[PDB]
mmCIF file of C-alpha atoms and ligand atoms in Angstrom:
data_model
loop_
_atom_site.group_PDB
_atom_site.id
_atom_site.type_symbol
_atom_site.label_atom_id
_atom_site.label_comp_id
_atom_site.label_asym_id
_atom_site.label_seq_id
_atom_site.Cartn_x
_atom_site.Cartn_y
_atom_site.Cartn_z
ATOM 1 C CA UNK K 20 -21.432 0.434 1.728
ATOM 2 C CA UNK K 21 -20.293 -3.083 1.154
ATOM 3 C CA UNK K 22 -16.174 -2.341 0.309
ATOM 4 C CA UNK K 23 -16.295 -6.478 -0.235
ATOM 5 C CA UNK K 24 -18.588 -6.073 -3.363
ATOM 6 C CA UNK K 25 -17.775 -6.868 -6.229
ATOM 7 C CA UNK K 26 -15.390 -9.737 -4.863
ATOM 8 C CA UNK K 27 -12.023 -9.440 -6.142
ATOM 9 C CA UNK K 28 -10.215 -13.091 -7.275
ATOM 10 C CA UNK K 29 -7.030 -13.080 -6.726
ATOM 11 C CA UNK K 30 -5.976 -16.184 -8.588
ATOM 12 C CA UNK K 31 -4.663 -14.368 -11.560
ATOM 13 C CA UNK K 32 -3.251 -10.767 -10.612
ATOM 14 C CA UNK K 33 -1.120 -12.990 -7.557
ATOM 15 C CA UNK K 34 0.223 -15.708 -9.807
ATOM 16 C CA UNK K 35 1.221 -12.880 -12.402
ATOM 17 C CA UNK K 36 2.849 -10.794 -9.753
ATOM 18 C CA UNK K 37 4.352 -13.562 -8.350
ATOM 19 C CA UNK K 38 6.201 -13.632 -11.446
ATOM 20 C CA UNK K 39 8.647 -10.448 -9.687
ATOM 21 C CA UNK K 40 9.029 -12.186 -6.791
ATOM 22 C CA UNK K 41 12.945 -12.449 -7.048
ATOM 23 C CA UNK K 42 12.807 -8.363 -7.289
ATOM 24 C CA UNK K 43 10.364 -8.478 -4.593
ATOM 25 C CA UNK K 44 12.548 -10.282 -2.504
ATOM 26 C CA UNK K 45 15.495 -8.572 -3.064
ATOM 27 C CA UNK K 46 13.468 -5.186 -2.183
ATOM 28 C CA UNK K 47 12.169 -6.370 1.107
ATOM 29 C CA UNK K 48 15.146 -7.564 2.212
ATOM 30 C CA UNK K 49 16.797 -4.445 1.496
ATOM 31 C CA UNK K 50 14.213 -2.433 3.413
ATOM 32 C CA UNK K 51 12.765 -4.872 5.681
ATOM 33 C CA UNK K 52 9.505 -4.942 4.250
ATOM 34 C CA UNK K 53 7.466 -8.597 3.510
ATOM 35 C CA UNK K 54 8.005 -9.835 0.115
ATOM 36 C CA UNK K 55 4.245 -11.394 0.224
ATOM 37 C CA UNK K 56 3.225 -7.649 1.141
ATOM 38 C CA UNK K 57 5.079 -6.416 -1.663
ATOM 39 C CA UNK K 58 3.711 -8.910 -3.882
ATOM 40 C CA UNK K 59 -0.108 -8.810 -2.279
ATOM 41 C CA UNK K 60 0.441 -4.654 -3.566
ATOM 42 C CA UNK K 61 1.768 -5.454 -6.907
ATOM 43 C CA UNK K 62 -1.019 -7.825 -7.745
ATOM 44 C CA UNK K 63 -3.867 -5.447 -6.007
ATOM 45 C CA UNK K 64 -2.186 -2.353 -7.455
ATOM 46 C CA UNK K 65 -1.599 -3.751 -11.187
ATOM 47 C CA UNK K 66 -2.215 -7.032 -11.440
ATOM 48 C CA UNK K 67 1.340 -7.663 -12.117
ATOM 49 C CA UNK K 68 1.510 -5.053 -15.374
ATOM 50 C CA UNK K 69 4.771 -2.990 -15.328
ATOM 51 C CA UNK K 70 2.911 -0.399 -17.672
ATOM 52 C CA UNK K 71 -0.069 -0.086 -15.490
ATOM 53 C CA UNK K 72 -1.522 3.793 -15.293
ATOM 54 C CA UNK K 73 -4.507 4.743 -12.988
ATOM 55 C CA UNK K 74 -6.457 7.737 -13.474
ATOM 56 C CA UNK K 75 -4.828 9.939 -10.867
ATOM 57 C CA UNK K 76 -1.880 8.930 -13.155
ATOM 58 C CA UNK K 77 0.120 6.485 -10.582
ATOM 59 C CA UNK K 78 2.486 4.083 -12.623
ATOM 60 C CA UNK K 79 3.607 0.913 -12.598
ATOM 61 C CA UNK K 80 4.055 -2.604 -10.770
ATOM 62 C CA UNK K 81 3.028 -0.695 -7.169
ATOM 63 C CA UNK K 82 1.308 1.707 -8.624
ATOM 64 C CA UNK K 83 3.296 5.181 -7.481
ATOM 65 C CA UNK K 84 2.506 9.032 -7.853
ATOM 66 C CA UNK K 85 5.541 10.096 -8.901
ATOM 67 C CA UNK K 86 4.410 13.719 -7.045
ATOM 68 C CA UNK K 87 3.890 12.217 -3.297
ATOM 69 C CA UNK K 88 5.851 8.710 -2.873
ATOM 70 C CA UNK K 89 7.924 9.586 -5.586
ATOM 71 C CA UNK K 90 8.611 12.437 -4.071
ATOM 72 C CA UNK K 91 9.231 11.115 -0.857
ATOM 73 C CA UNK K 92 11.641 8.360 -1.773
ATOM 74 C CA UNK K 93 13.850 10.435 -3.698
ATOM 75 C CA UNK K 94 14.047 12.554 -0.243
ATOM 76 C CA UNK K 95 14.703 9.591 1.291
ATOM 77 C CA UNK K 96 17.841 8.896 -0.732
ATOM 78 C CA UNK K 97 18.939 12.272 -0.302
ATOM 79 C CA UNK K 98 17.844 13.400 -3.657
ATOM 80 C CA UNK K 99 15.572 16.288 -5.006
ATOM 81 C CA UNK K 100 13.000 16.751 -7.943
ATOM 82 C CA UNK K 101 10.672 13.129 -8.135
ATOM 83 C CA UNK K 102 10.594 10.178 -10.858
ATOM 84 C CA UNK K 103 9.303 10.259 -14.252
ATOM 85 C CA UNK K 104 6.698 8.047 -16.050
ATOM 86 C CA UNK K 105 8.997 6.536 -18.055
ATOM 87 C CA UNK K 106 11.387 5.536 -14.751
ATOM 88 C CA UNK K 107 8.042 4.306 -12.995
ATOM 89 C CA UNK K 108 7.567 1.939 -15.597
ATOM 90 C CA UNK K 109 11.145 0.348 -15.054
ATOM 91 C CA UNK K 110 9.827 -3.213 -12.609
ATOM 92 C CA UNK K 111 12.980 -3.176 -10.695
ATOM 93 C CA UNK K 112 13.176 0.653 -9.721
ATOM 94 C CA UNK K 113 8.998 0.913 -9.110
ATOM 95 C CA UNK K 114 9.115 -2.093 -6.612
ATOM 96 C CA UNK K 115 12.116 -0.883 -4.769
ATOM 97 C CA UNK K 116 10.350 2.642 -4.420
ATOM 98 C CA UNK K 117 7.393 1.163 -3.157
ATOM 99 C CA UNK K 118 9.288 -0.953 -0.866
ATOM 100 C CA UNK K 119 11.203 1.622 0.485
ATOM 101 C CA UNK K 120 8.062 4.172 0.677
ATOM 102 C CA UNK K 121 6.629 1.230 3.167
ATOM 103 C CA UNK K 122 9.746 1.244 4.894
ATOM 104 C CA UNK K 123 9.255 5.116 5.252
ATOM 105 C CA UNK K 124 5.275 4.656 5.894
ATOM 106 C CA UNK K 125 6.436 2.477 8.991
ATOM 107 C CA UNK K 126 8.939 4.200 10.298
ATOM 108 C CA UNK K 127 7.685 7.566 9.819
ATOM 109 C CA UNK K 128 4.188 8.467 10.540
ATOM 110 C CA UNK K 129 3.045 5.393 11.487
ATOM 111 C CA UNK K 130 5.648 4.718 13.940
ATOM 112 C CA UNK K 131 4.467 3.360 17.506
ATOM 113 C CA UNK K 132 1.986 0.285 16.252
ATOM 114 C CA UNK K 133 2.729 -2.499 18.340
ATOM 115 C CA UNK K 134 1.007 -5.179 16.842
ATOM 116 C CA UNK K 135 2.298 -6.110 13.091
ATOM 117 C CA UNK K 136 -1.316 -6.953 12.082
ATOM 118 C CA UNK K 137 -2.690 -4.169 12.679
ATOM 119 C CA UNK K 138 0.385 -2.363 11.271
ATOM 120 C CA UNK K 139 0.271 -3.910 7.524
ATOM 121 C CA UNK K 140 -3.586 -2.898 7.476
ATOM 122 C CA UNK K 141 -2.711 0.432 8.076
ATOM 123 C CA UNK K 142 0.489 0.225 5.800
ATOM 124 C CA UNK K 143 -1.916 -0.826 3.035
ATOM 125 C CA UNK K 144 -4.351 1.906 4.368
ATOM 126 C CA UNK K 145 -1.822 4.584 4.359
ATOM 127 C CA UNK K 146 0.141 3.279 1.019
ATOM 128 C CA UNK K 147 -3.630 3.454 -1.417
ATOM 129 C CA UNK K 148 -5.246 6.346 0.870
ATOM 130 C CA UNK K 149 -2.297 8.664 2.491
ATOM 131 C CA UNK K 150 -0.984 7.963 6.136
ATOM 132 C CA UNK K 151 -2.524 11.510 7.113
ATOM 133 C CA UNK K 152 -5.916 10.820 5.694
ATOM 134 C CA UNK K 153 -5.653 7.511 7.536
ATOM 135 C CA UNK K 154 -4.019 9.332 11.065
ATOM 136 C CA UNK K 155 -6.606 12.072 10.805
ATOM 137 C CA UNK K 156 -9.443 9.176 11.604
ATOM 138 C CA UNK K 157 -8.575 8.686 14.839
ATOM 139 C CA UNK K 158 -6.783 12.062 15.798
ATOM 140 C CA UNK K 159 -5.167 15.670 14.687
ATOM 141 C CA UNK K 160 -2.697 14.806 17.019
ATOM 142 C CA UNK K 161 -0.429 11.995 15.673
ATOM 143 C CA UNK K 162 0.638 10.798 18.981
ATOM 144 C CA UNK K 163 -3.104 10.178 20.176
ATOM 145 C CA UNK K 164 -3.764 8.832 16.693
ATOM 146 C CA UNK K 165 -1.180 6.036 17.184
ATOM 147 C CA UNK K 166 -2.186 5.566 20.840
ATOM 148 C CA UNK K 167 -5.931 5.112 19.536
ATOM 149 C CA UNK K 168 -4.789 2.612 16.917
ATOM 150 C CA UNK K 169 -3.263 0.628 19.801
ATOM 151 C CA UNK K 170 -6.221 0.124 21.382
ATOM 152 C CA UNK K 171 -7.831 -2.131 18.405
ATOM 153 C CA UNK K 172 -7.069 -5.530 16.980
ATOM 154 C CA UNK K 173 -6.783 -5.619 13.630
ATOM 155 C CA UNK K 174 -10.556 -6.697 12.906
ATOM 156 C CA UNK K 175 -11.770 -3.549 14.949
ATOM 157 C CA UNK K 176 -9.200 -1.653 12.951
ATOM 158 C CA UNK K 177 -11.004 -2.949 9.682
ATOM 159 C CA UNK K 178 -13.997 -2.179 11.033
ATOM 160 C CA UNK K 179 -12.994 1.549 11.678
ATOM 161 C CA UNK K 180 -11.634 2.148 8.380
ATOM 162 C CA UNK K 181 -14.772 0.812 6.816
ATOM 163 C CA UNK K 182 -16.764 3.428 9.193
ATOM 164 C CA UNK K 183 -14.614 6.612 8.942
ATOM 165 C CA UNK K 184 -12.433 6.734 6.213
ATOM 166 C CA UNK K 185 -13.625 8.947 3.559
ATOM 167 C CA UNK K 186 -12.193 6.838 0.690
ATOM 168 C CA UNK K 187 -14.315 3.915 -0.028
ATOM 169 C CA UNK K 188 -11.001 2.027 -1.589
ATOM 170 C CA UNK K 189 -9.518 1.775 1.914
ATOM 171 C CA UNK K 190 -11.454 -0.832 3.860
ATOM 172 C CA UNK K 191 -11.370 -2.681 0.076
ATOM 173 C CA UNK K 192 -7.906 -2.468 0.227
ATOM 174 C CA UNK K 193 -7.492 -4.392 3.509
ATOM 175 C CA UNK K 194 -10.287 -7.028 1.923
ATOM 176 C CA UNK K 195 -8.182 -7.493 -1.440
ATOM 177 C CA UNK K 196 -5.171 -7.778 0.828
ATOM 178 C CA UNK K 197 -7.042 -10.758 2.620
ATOM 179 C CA UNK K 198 -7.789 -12.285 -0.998
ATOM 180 C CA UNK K 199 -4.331 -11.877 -2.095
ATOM 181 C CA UNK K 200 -2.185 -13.533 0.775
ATOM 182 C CA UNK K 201 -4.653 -16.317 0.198
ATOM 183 C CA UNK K 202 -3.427 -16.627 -3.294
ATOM 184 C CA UNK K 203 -0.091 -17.074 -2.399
HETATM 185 C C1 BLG H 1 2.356 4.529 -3.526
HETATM 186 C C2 BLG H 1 1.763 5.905 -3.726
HETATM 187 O O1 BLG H 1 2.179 6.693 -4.568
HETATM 188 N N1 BLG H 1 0.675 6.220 -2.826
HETATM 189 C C3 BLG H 1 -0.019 7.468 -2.891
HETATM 190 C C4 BLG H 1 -1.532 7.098 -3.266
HETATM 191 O O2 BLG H 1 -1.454 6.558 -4.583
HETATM 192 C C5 BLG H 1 -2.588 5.669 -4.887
HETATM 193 C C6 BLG H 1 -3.846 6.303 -5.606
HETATM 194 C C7 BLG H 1 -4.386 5.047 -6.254
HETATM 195 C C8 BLG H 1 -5.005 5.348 -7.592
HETATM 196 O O3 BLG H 1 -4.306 5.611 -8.568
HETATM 197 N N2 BLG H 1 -6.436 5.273 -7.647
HETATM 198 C C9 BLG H 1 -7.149 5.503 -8.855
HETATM 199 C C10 BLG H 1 -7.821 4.207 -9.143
HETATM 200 S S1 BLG H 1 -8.697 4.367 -10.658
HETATM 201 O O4 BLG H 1 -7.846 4.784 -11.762
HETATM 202 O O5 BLG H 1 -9.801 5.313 -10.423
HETATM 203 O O6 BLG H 1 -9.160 3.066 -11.098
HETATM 204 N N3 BLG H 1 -3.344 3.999 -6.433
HETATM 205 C C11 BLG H 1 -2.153 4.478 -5.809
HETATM 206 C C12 BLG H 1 -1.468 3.390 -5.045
HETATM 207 O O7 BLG H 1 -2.372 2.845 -4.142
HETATM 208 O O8 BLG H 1 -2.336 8.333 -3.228
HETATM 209 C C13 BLG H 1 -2.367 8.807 -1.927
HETATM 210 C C14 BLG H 1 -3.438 9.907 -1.819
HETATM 211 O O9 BLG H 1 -3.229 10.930 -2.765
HETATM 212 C C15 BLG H 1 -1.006 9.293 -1.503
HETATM 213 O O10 BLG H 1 -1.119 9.754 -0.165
HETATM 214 S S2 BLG H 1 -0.379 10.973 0.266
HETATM 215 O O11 BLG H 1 0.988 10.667 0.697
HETATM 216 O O12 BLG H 1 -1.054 11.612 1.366
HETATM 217 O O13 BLG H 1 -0.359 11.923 -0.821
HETATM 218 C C16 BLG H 1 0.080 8.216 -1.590
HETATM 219 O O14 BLG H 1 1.375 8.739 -1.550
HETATM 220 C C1 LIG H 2 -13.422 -4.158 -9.245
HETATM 221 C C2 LIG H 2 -11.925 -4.236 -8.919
HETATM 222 O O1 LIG H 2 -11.569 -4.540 -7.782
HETATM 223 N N1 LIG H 2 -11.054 -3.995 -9.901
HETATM 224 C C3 LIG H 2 -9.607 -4.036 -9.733
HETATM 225 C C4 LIG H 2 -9.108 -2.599 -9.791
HETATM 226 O O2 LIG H 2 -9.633 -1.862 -8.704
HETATM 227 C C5 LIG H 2 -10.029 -0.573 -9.150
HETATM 228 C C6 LIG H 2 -9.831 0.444 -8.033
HETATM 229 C C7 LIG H 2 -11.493 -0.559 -9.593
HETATM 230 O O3 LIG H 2 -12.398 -0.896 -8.786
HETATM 231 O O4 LIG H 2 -11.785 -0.209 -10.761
HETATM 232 C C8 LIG H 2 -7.587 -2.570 -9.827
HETATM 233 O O5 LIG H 2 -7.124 -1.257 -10.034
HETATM 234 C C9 LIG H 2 -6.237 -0.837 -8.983
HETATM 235 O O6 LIG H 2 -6.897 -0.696 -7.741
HETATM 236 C C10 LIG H 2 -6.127 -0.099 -6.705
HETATM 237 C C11 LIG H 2 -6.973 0.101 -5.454
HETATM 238 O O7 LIG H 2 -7.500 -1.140 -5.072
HETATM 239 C C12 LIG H 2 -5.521 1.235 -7.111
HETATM 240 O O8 LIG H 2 -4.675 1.645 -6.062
HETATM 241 C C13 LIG H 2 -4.707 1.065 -8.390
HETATM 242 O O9 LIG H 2 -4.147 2.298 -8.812
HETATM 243 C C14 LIG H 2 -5.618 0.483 -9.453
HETATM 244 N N2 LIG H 2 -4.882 0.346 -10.696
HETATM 245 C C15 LIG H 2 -5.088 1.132 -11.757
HETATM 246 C C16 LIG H 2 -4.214 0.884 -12.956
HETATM 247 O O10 LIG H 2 -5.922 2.040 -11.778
HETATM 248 C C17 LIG H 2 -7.078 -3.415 -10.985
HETATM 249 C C18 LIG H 2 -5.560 -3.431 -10.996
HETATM 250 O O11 LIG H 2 -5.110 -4.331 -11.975
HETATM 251 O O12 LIG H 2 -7.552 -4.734 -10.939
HETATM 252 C C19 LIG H 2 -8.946 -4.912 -10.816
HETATM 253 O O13 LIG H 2 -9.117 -6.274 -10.498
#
């Protein structure tokens, strides 16, 4: 299957999330995470609308579950329960959750990838798709998984997403991630 097709112009949904960039900014640098990554995700993930609501009901500017990286930021801050809607919607708080759930994404379970190419695919990968779903590819043992991913560049990487990962929207991801930076 062609994840390229349609072809996604980025034009519009990176100029309007450019429009957060000083929140974007201010997120990265607080959990070392790219502001043009944050802002590649905002455009790909709502096109820059702070009201955005998919399907499987993620919200806002980065497009969050409140029940998994919702979930897992407030653990992160040493909190329990998980976000609402309503607090999703806010621009400043959704962008600094999904900053620091890439900060947690990279230091967590993907942990180990040497090269930062390959890295921000699977960030993206592991961000839209889960970082187990994305692991699970390559290994059931994380270790091996992250020694596998070591062993590609981050075209072969591409490649193997686009073979063996179950959800079509992952290899699209890295492709609208492509688009985006372009954009910028
Ligand atoms: C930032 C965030 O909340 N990412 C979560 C992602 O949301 C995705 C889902 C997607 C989405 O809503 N797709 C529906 C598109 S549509 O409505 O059909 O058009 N957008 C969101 C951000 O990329 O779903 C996966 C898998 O469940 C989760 O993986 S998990 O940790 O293993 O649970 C991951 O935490
Ligand atoms: C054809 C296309 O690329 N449309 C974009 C759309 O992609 C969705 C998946 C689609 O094909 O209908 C995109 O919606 C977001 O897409 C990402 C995955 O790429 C999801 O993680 C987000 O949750 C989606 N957002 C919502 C609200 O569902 C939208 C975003 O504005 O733009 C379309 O250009």
């Amino acid at each position: 299957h062609d994840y390229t097709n349609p072809p996604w112009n980025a034009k519009v949904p990176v100029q309007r999330a450019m429009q957060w960039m000083p929140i974007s900014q201010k997120a990265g640098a607080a959990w070392g995470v790219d502001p043009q990554l944050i802002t590649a995700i905002i455009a790909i993930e709502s096109g820059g609308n702070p009201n955005a609501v998919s399907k499987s009901n993620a919200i806002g500017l980065m497009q969050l579950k409140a029940s998994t990286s919702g979930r897992d930021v407030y653990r992160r801050m040493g909190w329990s329960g998980e976000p609402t809607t309503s607090e999703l919607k806010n621009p400043e708080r959704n962008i600094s959750m999904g900053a620091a759930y890439l900060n947690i994404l990279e230091t967590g379970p993907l942990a180990g990838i040497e090269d930062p190419k390959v890295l921000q695919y699977a960030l993206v990968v592991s961000y839209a798709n889960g970082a187990g779903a994305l692991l699970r590819t390559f290994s059931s043992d994380r270790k091996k998984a992250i020694s596998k991913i070591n062993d590609l560049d981050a075209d072969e990487f591409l490649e193997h997403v686009a073979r063996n990962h179950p959800a079509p929207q992952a290899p699209r991801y890295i492709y609208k991630l492509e688009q985006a930076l372009d954009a910028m």
